[PDB]
RNA sequence: GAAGACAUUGUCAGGUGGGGAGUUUGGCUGGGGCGGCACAUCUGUUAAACGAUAACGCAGAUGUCCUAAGGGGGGCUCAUGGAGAACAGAAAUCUCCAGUAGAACAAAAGGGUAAAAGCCCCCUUGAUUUUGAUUUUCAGUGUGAAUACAAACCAUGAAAGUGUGGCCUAUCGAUCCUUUAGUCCCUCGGAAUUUGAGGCUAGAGGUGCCAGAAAAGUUACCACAGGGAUAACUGGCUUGUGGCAGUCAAGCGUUCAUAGCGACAUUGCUUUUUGAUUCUUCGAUGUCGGCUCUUCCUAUCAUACCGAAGCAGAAUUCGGUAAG
RNA sequence: UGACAUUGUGAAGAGACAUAGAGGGCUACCUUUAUAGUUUCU
RNA sequence: GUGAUUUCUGCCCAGUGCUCUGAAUGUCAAAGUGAAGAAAUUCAACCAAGCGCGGGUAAACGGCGGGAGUAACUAUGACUC
RNA sequence: AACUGGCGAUGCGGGAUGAACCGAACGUAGAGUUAAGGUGCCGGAAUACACGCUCAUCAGACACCACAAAAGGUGUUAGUU
RNA sequence: UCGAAUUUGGGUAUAGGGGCGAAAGACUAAUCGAACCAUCUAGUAGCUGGUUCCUGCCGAAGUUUCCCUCAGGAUAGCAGAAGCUCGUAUCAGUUUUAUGAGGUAAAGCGAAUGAUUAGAGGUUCCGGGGUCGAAAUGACCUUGACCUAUUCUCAAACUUUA
RNA sequence: AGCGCCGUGACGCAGUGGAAGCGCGCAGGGCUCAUAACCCUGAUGUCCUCGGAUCGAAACCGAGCGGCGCUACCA
RNA sequence: GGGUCGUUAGCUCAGUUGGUAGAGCAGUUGACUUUUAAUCAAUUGGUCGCAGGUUCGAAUCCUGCACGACCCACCA
RNA sequence: AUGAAA
């Protein structure tokens, strides 16, 4: 027949996620020394909508 | 073309198939035999013939 | 609602799937349109039971 | 059809050349050897891509086989074949045909 | 940090796999499809008194069956009817007379047969080997079936004789492959032995579309080469069917077959229906109805003039010249 | 999915293969038991 | 897959699919093991998944019957087979 | 479908007209004689000879061929008893 | 239909069994049930069309058998050409004499088989019975069988004859 | 128009050449004051009709009679 | 508009394919009962819609004739 | 389990 929608969404020309209005990844800070031997202080400076 | 629905006789299992009306389909050579019955041993039925 | 070229449900003078939509996990890429690796179907009546 | 177990028939056996007694037996089609040239060629022919390569027959009609015999001379042990007509039911153990009997 | 000789990756083998690929999807045919087999065959008839002879012509049949239902020999004669014989009657078993076949011979049908080819009894496996010749279908090719001999070995019979399957007409299968029997023969090609493999002669395993491919559909999205060899419009021959008009008159009509009707029967006409055929047209005749508009036929609905009436008048029915 | 290779270093069980003894319908099993080696699942 | 809201989604897991068992003399490839043979090779056992066996599943594909008799008019048939 | 002869492949003379019917099969010409068909005019050939039938207010006119039937008529002619 | 699932420029991505599709098999440069270009390729065709000067001589077939064979081939036949061996006969789409074979036309059914019309005359140990009567293989009457000779019509799968 | 199926007691439905099955219905006895139910018993099927083959069929093959089913497309 | 089927007691239904109308419901009388109902017995009704052949002879054989019950009916 | 009308 012909390729079908999921079978083209894998290849992903027009189905790639949109990225212009995102703040990057949301992640936990790296487990370097402090989070596995003690703690560290941080300041929530702001809160923001992610698109 | 003919749809056929038939009962497996030694098992009791339905079997539906279909194939054109003019193509060849195999048939076995079924036979009934009317056997008399005597004293039943372990699970094997016990039937005799006239000769 | 598609054509039979465009999907494994498509075509027919009536909008009907025709061949059952419950698809094996060991199917292939091209056949896995529909309900995939399903254990039961229909309306559940009761509890998720977990 | 029915046949006895022994038969008086010609034996071209280089000492009989006359009517001797012959033990009859059926002909069984015989187990197939590998390494016969057809099977060797066929395994080579099917080796690899191309799918099926020789025909294979399904449009079948005959519901009977010809029955065929082996004739073992009592003196020479010289086997011999002779063929008979087509029969659905065949038998060598012969309960004779008694004419004067009931149903 | 995790995980650890597992995973992974490589190569083979088993499965699943229209997701994808390749290919096929018989023939005959009063168009094709459904149906059927007239596709391999057999009997009788069509078939026109040698032979041959068609159609989806008629009535049927075959893909099987028999160690006897084959071969020989001997003894009897069948179906049916009449007259009897307890139970026993229409039909149980026995006897006599007639009994040219009216029975039986594996089956379909047709031939054939009466000290037999039928029924019973006795003995057997000629339903065996070597291969050639001949007939039928016929290309005088093959397959199948059958005929008559030769060389052997046998059966049966007192013997002449008869016997190579079934009383005759049908009952079946090439190459390649597999397998078996015979010769225990040939070869395996640097020389040997032994396994194994390949050869010669003769059979089976099967192609029923039966001189023998290995094979499902759809397309109204459709494509191509063609076809009036082939359908659906119109026309043409035909008119069953549709319609119209006659001949006869059992009866209806108060009395009376005919004023008007006219059963049972039958002869015609028309092509306005609907079939049948396939002559023309498939390198296209634009295909139903309505609207418009002309013209023609009469088997006249009305109007003109008439005839008949179960026509008093009125109204009506039948009929003639008549398509103005 | 399985086998081999990749792929080296360790053990703790269990199942079966042959020998002998008890419970069983001249005697075949099945239930068990004790052996020197052999394979295989965890 | 179905197509706002309201109301409501009945019965059928036999078939085809999907999925979960393994407690099994079924089937069971290659590699590997044993026996025979002088070897090619043959034969036997074992045996992964799958298939077979058995559960679940219909807002999965889909499916959802006939015949009789009977009521104080007759007809009809609550009822019964 | 059978037998034969033709048409296809075949002109000429006739059937007005026509693949097949009838006559006859073909070199180029001349002279005669015929076939089948015809002789009022078209049209070459007798409006010939002879014996009768028919008047039709839808005559009839020459094979295949181009239609016409059952049933009737004090029309008319010739007959039978 | 018109403030939006709105309309639009430019850049940019997705490429042919692939893309893209608010889904029509629509769009993919006037091309879409698989674009366009070039080659393989002078692809294949049992199918259609066409197939080039003159004259002379001879001159057909649409039939047999087999073929996934029915618009085509192979084969045999029909027909040309090359001739070869001999020279009036080892011939004839013919008649006559003699001898065979056929079972169609026609004919027949008081001849077999099958079908068929109607009577009479009998046999009733004889089918149904109606009567005389207790009944009686006793008696009578009627009505279907059977028997006798008769009559009418028939047969592609009936036949003496022919 | 063409093809196929089916006809079993009163009713429904099985039925295989050696010879009819089940359930309901029906009848009789017993319990019951009576019927139902219940317990003990028994019976009824030219197997549509005709013919044929067969030693013999309900079955197997023609005829008819009846009740149904399937085809009916491309124009 | 034709092709088929049938019009049976007051109601309904077999009929017998040819010689005689049968069954049920209904009604009338009787039995039963204190009288009824139901139940049991007996009779009642029948040219079976108009003419033909006519089996000796006809409702049913079938020919037409008035009532009904089904099946068909441009065409591209 | 049921038990007609006055």
UniProtKB/Swiss-Prot annotation, chain A:
Describe the task this protein carries out: Component of the ribosome, a large ribonucleoprotein complex responsible for the synthesis of proteins in the cell. The small ribosomal subunit (SSU) binds messenger RNAs (mRNAs) and translates the encoded message by selecting cognate aminoacyl-transfer RNA (tRNA) molecules. The large subunit (LSU) contains the ribosomal catalytic site termed the peptidyl transferase center (PTC), which catalyzes the formation of peptide bonds, thereby polymerizing the amino acids delivered by tRNAs into a polypeptide chain.
Residues with PTM Phosphoserine: 51
Which sites are covalently linked via Glycyl lysine isopeptide (Lys-Gly) (interchain with G-Cter in ubiquitin)?
45
UniProt-recorded name of the protein: Large ribosomal subunit protein uL2A
Describe its partners and assembly state: Component of the large ribosomal subunit (LSU). Mature yeast ribosomes consist of a small (40S) and a large (60S) subunit. The 40S small subunit contains 1 molecule of ribosomal RNA (18S rRNA) and 33 different proteins (encoded by 57 genes). The large 60S subunit contains 3 rRNA molecules (25S, 5.8S and 5S rRNA) and 46 different proteins (encoded by 81 genes).
Source organism per UniProt: Saccharomyces cerevisiae (strain ATCC 204508 / S288c) (Baker's yeast)
Give the miscellaneous note. Answer: There are 2 genes for uL2 in yeast.
Domain of life from the UniProt record: Eukaryota
Give its localization.
Cytoplasm
Gene (name only): RPL2A
Q: Which residues of the full protein are shown?
A: 2 to 52 of 254
Which ranges form a coiled coil?
none
From Swiss-Prot, chain B:
Query: Subunit comment for this entry?
Result: Homodimer. Binds to 80S ribosomes. Actively translating ribosomes show mutually exclusive binding of eIF5a (HYP2 or ANB1) and EFT1/eEF2. Interacts with DYS1 and LIA1.
* Source organism: Saccharomyces cerevisiae (strain ATCC 204508 / S288c) (Baker's yeast)
Q: What is this protein called?
A: Eukaryotic translation initiation factor 5A-1
Query: Biological process (GO) annotations?
Result: CAT tailing; cytoplasmic translational elongation; cytoplasmic translational elongation through polyproline stretches; cytoplasmic translational termination; positive regulation of cytoplasmic translational elongation through polyproline stretches; positive regulation of translational elongation; positive regulation of translational initiation; positive regulation of translational termination
- Which positions does the record annotate as the modified residue Phosphoserine? 19
The reported result of mutating residue 47 to A is: Temperature-sensitive growth phenotype. Impaired ability to promote CAT tailing in response to ribosome stalling
Record-stated family: Belongs to the eIF-5A family.
Ranges in coiled-coil conformation: none
Q: Which residues cross the membrane?
A: none
One GO cellular component assignment for this chain's record is: cytoplasm
Result of altering residue 28 to S/L: Temperature-sensitive growth phenotype. Lethal
* Record keywords: Acetylation, Cytoplasm, Elongation factor, Hypusine, Isopeptide bond, Phosphoprotein, Protein biosynthesis, RNA-binding, Ubl conjugation
User: Which residues form the Glycyl lysine isopeptide (Lys-Gly) (interchain with G-Cter in ubiquitin) crosslink?
Assistant: 31
Q: Which gene encodes it?
A: HYP2
Q: Spell out the note in the miscellaneous section.
A: There are two genes for eIF-5A in yeast.
Stretch of the intact protein here: 56 to 106 of 157
Q: What is the lineage of its organism?
A: Eukaryota, Fungi, Dikarya, Ascomycota, Saccharomycotina
Q: What is the effect of changing residue 38 to F?
A: Lethal. Reduced binding to the ribosome
What is expression of this protein induced or repressed by? Expressed in aerobic conditions.
Q: Where in the cell is it found?
A: Cytoplasm
Keyword Transmembrane helix part of the UniProt annotation? no
Query: Under the GO molecular function aspect, what terms does this record hold?
Result: ribosome binding; RNA binding; translation elongation factor activity; translation initiation factor activity
**Main location per UniProt?**
cytoplasm
- Per the record's keyword annotation, is Phosphoprotein included, yes or no? yes
UniProtKB/Swiss-Prot annotation, chain D:
Q: Name one GO biological process term.
A: response to cycloheximide
What other remark does the UniProt record contain for this protein?
Present with 13600 molecules/cell in log phase SD medium. There are 2 genes for eL42 in yeast.
Query: Taxonomic lineage of this organism?
Result: Eukaryota, Fungi, Dikarya, Ascomycota, Saccharomycotina
What residue ranges are annotated as transmembrane?
none
Report the function annotation for this chain.
Component of the ribosome, a large ribonucleoprotein complex responsible for the synthesis of proteins in the cell. The small ribosomal subunit (SSU) binds messenger RNAs (mRNAs) and translates the encoded message by selecting cognate aminoacyl-transfer RNA (tRNA) molecules. The large subunit (LSU) contains the ribosomal catalytic site termed the peptidyl transferase center (PTC), which catalyzes the formation of peptide bonds, thereby polymerizing the amino acids delivered by tRNAs into a polypeptide chain.
Q: Which PANTHER family match?
A: 60S RIBOSOMAL PROTEIN L36A/L44
Question: Known post-translational modifications?
Answer: In wild-type cells, 78% of L42 is monomethylated at both Lys-39 and Lys-54, and 22% are a mixture of species with either residue monomethylated.
Q: Which family does it belong to?
A: Belongs to the eukaryotic ribosomal protein eL42 family.
Its localization reads:
Cytoplasm
The chain residues annotated with the modification N6-methyllysine are 39, 54
> InterPro entries per the record?
Ribosomal_eL44, Ribosomal_LSU_eL42, Ribosomal_zn-bd
Assembly, in brief, is: Component of the large ribosomal subunit (LSU). Mature yeast ribosomes consist of a small (40S) and a large (60S) subunit. The 40S small subunit contains 1 molecule of ribosomal RNA (18S rRNA) and 33 different proteins (encoded by 57 genes). The large 60S subunit contains 3 rRNA molecules (25S, 5.8S and 5S rRNA) and 46 different proteins (encoded by 81 genes).
Pfam families assigned to the protein according to its UniProt record, in alphabetical order: Ribosomal_L44 (PF00935)
**UniProt xrefs under SUPFAM superfamilies:** Zn-binding ribosomal proteins
- What is the name of this protein? Large ribosomal subunit protein eL42A
Per UniProt, the keywords (alphabetical) are: Antibiotic resistance, Cycloheximide resistance, Cytoplasm, Methylation, Ribonucleoprotein, Ribosomal protein
Q: Which organism is it from?
A: Saccharomyces cerevisiae (strain ATCC 204508 / S288c)
Any one of the GO CC terms: cytosol
PROSITE patterns registered for this protein in UniProt: RIBOSOMAL_L44E (PS01172)
Give the molecular function GO annotations: structural constituent of ribosome
């Amino acid at each position: 027949g012909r390729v079908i929608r999921n079978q083209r969404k894998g290849a992903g020309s027009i189905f790639t996620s949109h990225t212009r209005l995102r703040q990057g990844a949301a992640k936990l800070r790296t487990l370097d020394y402090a989070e596995r031997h003690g703690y560290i202080r941080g300041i929530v400076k702001q809160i923001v909508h992610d698109s | 073309k003919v749809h056929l629905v038939a009962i497996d006789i030694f098992t009791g299992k339905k079997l539906e198939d279909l194939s054109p009306s003019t193509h060849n389909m195999e048939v076995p050579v079924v036979k009934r035999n009317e056997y008399q019955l005597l004293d039943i041993d372990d699970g094997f039925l016990s039937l005799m013939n006239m000769d | 609602a598609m054509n039979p070229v465009d999907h494994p449900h498509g075509g027919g003078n009536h909008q009907h799937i025709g061949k059952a939509s419950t698809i094996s996990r060991g199917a292939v890429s091209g056949q896995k349109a529909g309900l995939i690796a399903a254990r039961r179907t229909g309306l559940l009546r009761g509890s998720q039971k977990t | 059809v029915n046949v006895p177990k022994t038969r008086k028939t010609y034996c071209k056996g280089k000492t009989c050349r006359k009517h001797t007694q012959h033990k009859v037996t059926q002909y069984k089609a015989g187990k197939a050897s590998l390494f016969a040239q057809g099977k060797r060629r066929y395994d080579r022919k099917q080796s690899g891509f191309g799918g099926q390569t020789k025909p294979v027959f399904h449009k079948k009609a005959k519901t009977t086989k010809k029955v065929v015999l082996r004739l073992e001379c009592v003196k020479c042990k010289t086997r011999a074949q002779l063929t008979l007509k087509r029969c659905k039911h065949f038998e060598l153990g012969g309960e004779k045909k008694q004419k004067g009997q009931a149903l």
